[PDB]
């Protein structure tokens, strides 16, 4: 069911709006972005 290549984005859409969301809360709440920003994915 994981990685895309099915035009249908339903199911997808919605886990990935809540993967972002969720995310850039927890960004600011723990190291992941301390991670991202020191191996320049930011």
């Known amino acids: 069911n ?3 290549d099915l035009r ?3 199911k997808d859409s ?3 709006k809540l993967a972002l ?3 850039l809360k927890k960004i600011k709440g723990t190291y ?3 991670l ?3 191996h320049k994915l930011l």
């Open 14 to 16: 919605k886990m990935q």
């Open 8 to 10: 249908e984005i339903t």
């Open 32 to 34: 992941i972005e301390s």
């Open 21 to 23: 969301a969720g995310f």
């Open 2 to 4: 994981d990685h895309q």
């Open 36 to 38: 991202l920003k020191e």
